[PDB]
Amino acid sequence: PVNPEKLLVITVATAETEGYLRFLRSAEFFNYTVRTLGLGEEWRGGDVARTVGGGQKVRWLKKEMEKYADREDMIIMFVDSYDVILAGSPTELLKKFVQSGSRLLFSAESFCWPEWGLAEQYPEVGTGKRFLNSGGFIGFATTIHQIVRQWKYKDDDDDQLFYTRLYLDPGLREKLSLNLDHKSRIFQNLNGALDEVVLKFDRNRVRIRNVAYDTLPIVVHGNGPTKLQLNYLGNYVPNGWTPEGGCGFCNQDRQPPPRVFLAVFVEQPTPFLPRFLQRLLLLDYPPDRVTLFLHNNEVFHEPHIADSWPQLQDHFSAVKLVGPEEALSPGEARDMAMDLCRQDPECEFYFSLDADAVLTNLQTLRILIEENRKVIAPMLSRHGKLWSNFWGALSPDEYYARSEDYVELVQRKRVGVWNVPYISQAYVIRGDTLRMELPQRDVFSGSDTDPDMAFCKSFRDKGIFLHLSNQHEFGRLLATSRYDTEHLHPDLWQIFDNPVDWKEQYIHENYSRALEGEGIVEQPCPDVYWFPLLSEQMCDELVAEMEHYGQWSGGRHEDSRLAGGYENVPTVDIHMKQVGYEDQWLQLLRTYVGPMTESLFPGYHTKARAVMNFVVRYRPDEQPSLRPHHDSSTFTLNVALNHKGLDYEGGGCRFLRYDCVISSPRKGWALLHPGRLTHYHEGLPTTWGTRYIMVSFVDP
Amino acid sequence: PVNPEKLLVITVATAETEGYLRFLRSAEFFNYTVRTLGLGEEWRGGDVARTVGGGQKVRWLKKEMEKYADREDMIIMFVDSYDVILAGSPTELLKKFVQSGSRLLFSAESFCWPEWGLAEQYPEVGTGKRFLNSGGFIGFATTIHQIVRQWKYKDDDDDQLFYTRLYLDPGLREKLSLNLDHKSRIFQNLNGALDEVVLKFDRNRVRIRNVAYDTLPIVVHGNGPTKLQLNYLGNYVPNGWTPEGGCGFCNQDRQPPPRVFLAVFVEQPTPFLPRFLQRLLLLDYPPDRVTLFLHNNEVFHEPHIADSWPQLQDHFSAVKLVGPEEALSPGEARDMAMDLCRQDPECEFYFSLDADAVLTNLQTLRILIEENRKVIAPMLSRHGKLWSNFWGALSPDEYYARSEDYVELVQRKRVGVWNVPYISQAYVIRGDTLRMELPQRDVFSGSDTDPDMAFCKSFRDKGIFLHLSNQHEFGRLLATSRYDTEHLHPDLWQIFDNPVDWKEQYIHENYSRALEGEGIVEQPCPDVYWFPLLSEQMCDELVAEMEHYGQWSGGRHEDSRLAGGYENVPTVDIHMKQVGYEDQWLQLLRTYVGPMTESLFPGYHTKARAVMNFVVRYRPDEQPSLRPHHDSSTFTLNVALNHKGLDYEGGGCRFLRYDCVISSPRKGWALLHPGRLTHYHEGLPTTWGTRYIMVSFVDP
Numbered sequence A, B: 001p002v003n004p005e006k007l008l009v010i011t012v013a014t015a016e017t018e019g020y021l022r023f024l025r026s027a028e029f030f031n032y033t034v035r036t037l038g039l040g041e042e043w044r045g046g047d048v049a050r051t052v053g054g055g056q057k058v059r060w061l062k063k064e065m066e067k068y069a070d071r072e073d074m075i076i077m078f079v080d081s082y083d084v085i086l087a088g089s090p091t092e093l094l095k096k097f098v099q100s101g102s103r104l105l106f107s108a109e110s111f112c113w114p115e116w117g118l119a120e121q122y123p124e125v126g127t128g129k130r131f132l133n134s135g136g137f138i139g140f141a142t143t144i145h146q147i148v149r150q151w152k153y154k155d156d157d158d159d160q161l162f163y164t165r166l167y168l169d170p171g172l173r174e175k176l177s178l179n180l181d182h183k184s185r186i187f188q189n190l191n192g193a194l195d196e197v198v199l200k201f202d203r204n205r206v207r208i209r210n211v212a213y214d215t216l217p218i219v220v221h222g223n224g225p226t227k228l229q230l231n232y233l234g235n236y237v238p239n240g241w242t243p244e245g246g247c248g249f250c251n252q253d254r255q256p257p258p259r260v261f262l263a264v265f266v267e268q269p270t271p272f273l274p275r276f277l278q279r280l281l282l283l284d285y286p287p288d289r290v291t292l293f294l295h296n297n298e299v300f301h302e303p304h305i306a307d308s309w310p311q312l313q314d315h316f317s318a319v320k321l322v323g324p325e326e327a328l329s330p331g332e333a334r335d336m337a338m339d340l341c342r343q344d345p346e347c348e349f350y351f352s353l354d355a356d357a358v359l360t361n362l363q364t365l366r367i368l369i370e371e372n373r374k375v376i377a378p379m380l381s382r383h384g385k386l387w388s389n390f391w392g393a394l395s396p397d398e399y400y401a402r403s404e405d406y407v408e409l410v411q412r413k414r415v416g417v418w419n420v421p422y423i424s425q426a427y428v429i430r431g432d433t434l435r436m437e438l439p440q441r442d443v444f445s446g447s448d449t450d451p452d453m454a455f456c457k458s459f460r461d462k463g464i465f466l467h468l469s470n471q472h473e474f475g476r477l478l479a480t481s482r483y484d485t486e487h488l489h490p491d492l493w494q495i496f497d498n499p500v501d502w503k504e505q506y507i508h509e510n511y512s513r514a515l516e517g518e519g520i521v522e523q524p525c526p527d528v529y530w531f532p533l534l535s536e537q538m539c540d541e542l543v544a545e546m547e548h549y550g551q552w553s554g555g556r557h558e559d560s561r562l563a564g565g566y567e568n569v570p571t572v573d574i575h576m577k578q579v580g581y582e583d584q585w586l587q588l589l590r591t592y593v594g595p596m597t598e599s600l601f602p603g604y605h606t607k608a609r610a611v612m613n614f615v616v617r618y619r620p621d622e623q624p625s626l627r628p629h630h631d632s633s634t635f636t637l638n639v640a641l642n643h644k645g646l647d648y649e650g651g652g653c654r655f656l657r658y659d660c661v662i663s664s665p666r667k668g669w670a671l672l673h674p675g676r677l678t679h680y681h682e683g684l685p686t687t688w689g690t691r692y693i694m695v696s697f698v699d700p
């Protein structure tokens, strides 16, 4: 049993990047001892992510190995650090190295790189990997020194070609007992073997298994174009996220805060923008520490921005607007806003927030700053669907692809802070990162690629992690796909696409409490029920949309009312069908009115059928009253739409068989009464002003 | 101006018949002085209604004229008496006779009788009547004596041939100044001139006018086959019935009563016979003075007669039944019953009453006896129609014909006691008339003619008047045309044909009072109404007719009830359609339920549509309850059909949204409640016995 105190891990790292720090954490998890070579220096090995190189690694190792040229008691493993994580303990590692009977064991891979012609010189292996990979090897210090001391080449010569040529010396291979880890018992190189690797979970740690050879590798190496796949595994292996401990590096359970540049982007017509702009005043972060930047590309939203701008300017430390007259593309506007923070040393954090992002968590900015990341996004999902503001994987064309764990994250089965290839709509970026690591201005722009994709590729090309937190509930994403803007109030028609936000804006606030009972619903007359349904904004926008139509009812117009032996009781009204709002109003009936009817009349069942839906106008100049009648309905919904006293003087509804009068209707509230046989009723005259009501004859 | 005290009316009458007494009354109305010849004697003039004769009249007149052979101061008018009425005063008569310039003026007529060949010997008259009629003439006593003293012929020689031959003597006609009343200024003979005579009304007397000559005759002579036409005129002229005085000989405004033989006839299956038989015990006449005779020709009514016979035998002085086993024809049974009274001197009055005669006036027998007629019928009419128990006129074939005043009598515009050619269904006949004037037994029988027609012709052939009184409301006639007898209770199906009687037997007695208000209708639960609808006989016969069908509901049977989200709430029941009683029950809904619904729910209008009508049976052995549900109806009718406690133990109806229970239903009463949305309700379990209810889902 080889003593673990005789094991030394040597790696190269010219800067303490997020990958290197990820490698170190995995090493400290198993109590390895690591020696890092080249931390202060500048990288002369060339563009290794692009071509061959890395000879500077060998040179540094050869110098380090001269202290250990005679230490037969020492085992030494060399690994890369930016694209490597450790999955197993030193004890299992040393036991597996002894089992190989080798004195210097290299990793094996599927490709003969860089010189593909040398493939013939390699020994034949039946089913394992055949060729050498210099990203990882382990052996005796004496044997390693005999190999690395033969280095005498340029800092930008290929390290792997150097090791490959020595291995392909049959006499030297036999003499020094050199071997390749063909079946990935120790080293797992991901390139060319992505379908062979799966996660293997445990209670408080995670590993990978090679399903082609049924092994449990110690070293995972995201070599070549497998950096993102390793970023995926790195979220779990070894203690990233575990079934019993949750995530391992997130905050989990939670004097002046840092100054922040808040950048808002309105690049398409977006619903409920006034509601968003009012939410900016509610974010729980000292506004004297926040600088607001708002790019509006839509002339449809200029009235919205203008209404809010006095409140915003009075709220934040400083504000700035770049409207549609500047003709900035989305990529030019995002480059400008981020570059405003980059060129301001007082900008410690840059917060980008898009128009379709609803932040239900008012502590989002704080939560994300405490995570102490370079780039981090909060998880936002389109309500009740899988689409969200991030990607878990990329296609070979670097377009969208679903990851093996995407659904578990969106559904918050596994919660934590995740390293993902793509984020959008809302993120917080360290200002220091913009100055020192992403100093160019062409972040979102420069190419034909989409601005939000160029932004993510810009950070990945620098090895910056894009973090995503579902540790908390942060909010949702609005559907903006087919926003119909040709209305006086286009957000009225948003009951199908954004029903959660439509309810918060238009349904009465105390509706839901009334639906659960507890003494809100009233019964002012026998079998007539009274409950809050619509909000004052819903009433005002519905009335206004009616007047904007203008074509009210006149003579020869017929309603489905019953008086005497004839259906000749009309009203001055507009039907939902005429204004194109019938389907929308029927949806309100199914969702909110129907369930209220089944609660108040136990035993009755409704699907909220209604062919007669219309708004009535009562005025002394034209028709101020409505004579007694029955409704062609099983039950009738009667909703006031304005204020008694402020907007009109006069009475409401009278039920004759009871001599009961609804003398003072309430604006948002609705009346529920049967339409046939028993509740013969009358519309008292409007003496001053104008009286608007909404009425549906449901279940005819 | 000739003195009326010099006028003498001479007529012949061997018996004080009703025609002679009718003539005398018209004469006493104008204060004539009448001398009647031959009152004690027997008629030897032959069958004058059949052939020629009347010479006995001339012989009696010739003897009477010998006292006045020299009285030039005396005017004498001779008229028949059985078929003559006087329409004018003696003053107008004498003035018109003087205007003629004649010394003996005969009546004129259209036919040359008896010898038609003598028509050539008559003088030519342009437009008036050409030939002589011996039924009436007026002239000086001296001139009349010179004519009548030439009589020397047989008592059965023709009187008119005698006068005709003397008139056709041109020398004698010129000598004595003989003339014929060509244009009916004085004498109106009806035969051959029926279209020339109309009634002319006045305030307190009536006349006739000749519209061919525009005259107002004094003497109306129903000569030949015009006796019935004169009977018609005799109802008015001269003071029979007047617009201001009403009738002139009727009773108008009303110690042992005479003994009566009451004869009941059941010659066809007749509805509501048990109700008739119970009414016999209610007639307001001392039953110890009435002898009952009942002929039943129908085996269908033997159970009905048997149920009533103990009460009848205990009620009347003596009873007798002649059932279907005797095989008596209707004519043989009516001959027998009348002949039982004829051969009993203690029978003072004979009362014939048929099965289809409903006597609503319990004093009918008294009223008709006080009229002191030989034969008199009360007027009975089929409800709401013109058909009644009498004819006002005859066809030339002596079949039915409508009289000029028939409708005014049936509608009781003119009320009185009328001399009509035909009566039926109910009449009272003096027993003395049967013994002395109609002694034969073949009254209804003897020929192929209908028994009721033979009966009337038998009395007309003897000059007996058939009187009809509409002075009071007496009753009605049942429709018996298409009585469907193939039912356990055929009177249930009588709602269309006899609706007045159907209501009195089957509709609850206090229904109508409840329909007018005054605190009968109850509201035991909110918007549930409770009122009496059916009578106990209706409930018992409806239940019995259901069990007699027997095929109650079982599994797989579906009703139009709503529970949860399914219409799977069944009952053990029978639908009206299965038993052929749907049309009948729908008529009850239209007539009695509908009007009650519009009264209780003001503003609602109904035509009582109902596709679901059925009787439910609740039993502990099979289905004793009904789970909560709604009705596929605008409102529901729920009528109990038996007694709580006597017939079943258990609850009734529970309305859940109100926690209101109809725990003790009343048998005949009905519940009225809405079927949808508000009155979710439950049928409490029947713990003992059997619970029957009738239910309709009206206005679905």
Ligand SMILES: *[C@@H]1O[C@H](CO)[C@@H](O[C@@H]2O[C@H](CO)[C@@H](O)[C@H](O)[C@H]2NC(C)=O)[C@H](O)[C@H]1NC(C)=O
Pocket (backbone or CB within 6 Å): A509, A510
């Ligand atoms: C919803 O219900 C709340 C509480 O039931 C209402 O709040 C009250 O509003 C009135 C005036 O609008 C105040 O006088 C009370 O003091 C409020 N009560 C509380 C506890 O704050 C609220 O108004 C209702 N919403 C609407 C739209 O009427």
Ligand SMILES: *[C@@H]1O[C@H](CO)[C@@H](O[C@@H]2O[C@H](CO)[C@@H](O)[C@H](O)[C@H]2NC(C)=O)[C@H](O)[C@H]1NC(C)=O
Pocket (backbone or CB within 6 Å): B509, B510
């Ligand atoms: C119709 O109404 C009358 C009176 O409202 C009812 O007559 C009463 O009947 C009860 C018992 O049935 C007696 O105790 C009362 O003395 C009666 N009152 C009078 C004034 O006679 C009659 O019962 C009702 N008809 C039915 C079928 O119930």
Ligand SMILES: O=c1ccn([C@@H]2O[C@H](COP(=O)(O)OP(=O)(O)O)[C@@H](O)[C@H]2O)c(=O)[nH]1
Pocket (backbone or CB within 6 Å): A011, A012, A013, A014, A015, A043, A048, A049, A054, A057, A080, A081, A082, A083, A135, A222, A223, A224, A225
């Ligand atoms: O600027 C650099 C680039 C390279 N490296 C080290 O050189 C190794 C080789 O780089 P890389 O893993 O990207 O090459 P690959 O394994 O994909 O061939 C990295 O792991 C780092 O440890 C470094 O320290 N600084």
Ligand SMILES: O=c1ccn([C@@H]2O[C@H](COP(=O)(O)OP(=O)(O)O)[C@@H](O)[C@H]2O)c(=O)[nH]1
Pocket (backbone or CB within 6 Å): B011, B012, B013, B014, B015, B043, B048, B049, B054, B057, B080, B081, B082, B083, B135, B222, B223, B224, B225
């Ligand atoms: O039994 C009789 C039949 C006849 N008459 C008288 O004779 C008249 C002639 O009879 P009738 O009127 O019937 O004959 P007609 O006028 O029709 O030819 C009657 O009016 C009676 O006054 C009579 O007194 N007793």
Ligand SMILES: *[C@@H]1O[C@H](CO)[C@@H](O)[C@H](O)[C@H]1NC(C)=O
Pocket (backbone or CB within 6 Å): A029, A030, A031
């Ligand atoms: C690592 O070493 C520490 C002592 O330095 C020890 O407490 C801990 O249990 C070790 N962990 C593992 C996984 O060996």
Ligand SMILES: *[C@@H]1O[C@H](CO)[C@@H](O)[C@H](O)[C@H]1NC(C)=O
Pocket (backbone or CB within 6 Å): B029, B030, B031
């Ligand atoms: C008939 O005579 C009486 C007197 O005897 C007289 O009172 C009456 O008015 C007379 N009637 C007529 C109609 O002449």
Ligand SMILES: O=C(O)CCC(=O)C(=O)O
Pocket (backbone or CB within 6 Å): A561, A571, A616, A626, A631, A638, A652, A653, A681, A682, A683, A684, A693, A695
């Ligand atoms: O004016 C009212 O409140 C009654 C209106 C009404 O009943 C109807 O429009 O059907």
Ligand SMILES: O=C(O)CCC(=O)C(=O)O
Pocket (backbone or CB within 6 Å): B561, B571, B616, B626, B631, B638, B652, B653, B681, B682, B683, B684, B693, B695
């Ligand atoms: O048993 C009852 O009274 C209720 C019967 C009922 O509701 C029905 O038959 O529809």
Ligand SMILES: [Fe+2]
Pocket (backbone or CB within 6 Å): A553, A558, A559, A571, A573, A574, A575, A614
């Ligand atoms: Fe309308």
Ligand SMILES: [Fe+2]
Pocket (backbone or CB within 6 Å): A561, A629, A630, A631, A636, A681
């Ligand atoms: Fe209405």
Ligand SMILES: [Fe+2]
Pocket (backbone or CB within 6 Å): B553, B558, B559, B571, B573, B574, B575, B614
């Ligand atoms: Fe049924």
Ligand SMILES: [Fe+2]
Pocket (backbone or CB within 6 Å): B561, B629, B630, B631, B636, B681
């Ligand atoms: Fe029911």
Ligand SMILES: [Mn+2]
Pocket (backbone or CB within 6 Å): A080, A081, A082, A083, A084, A135, A221, A222, A223, A224
């Ligand atoms: Mn590497």
Ligand SMILES: [Mn+2]
Pocket (backbone or CB within 6 Å): B080, B081, B082, B083, B084, B135, B221, B222, B223, B224
């Ligand atoms: Mn005559």
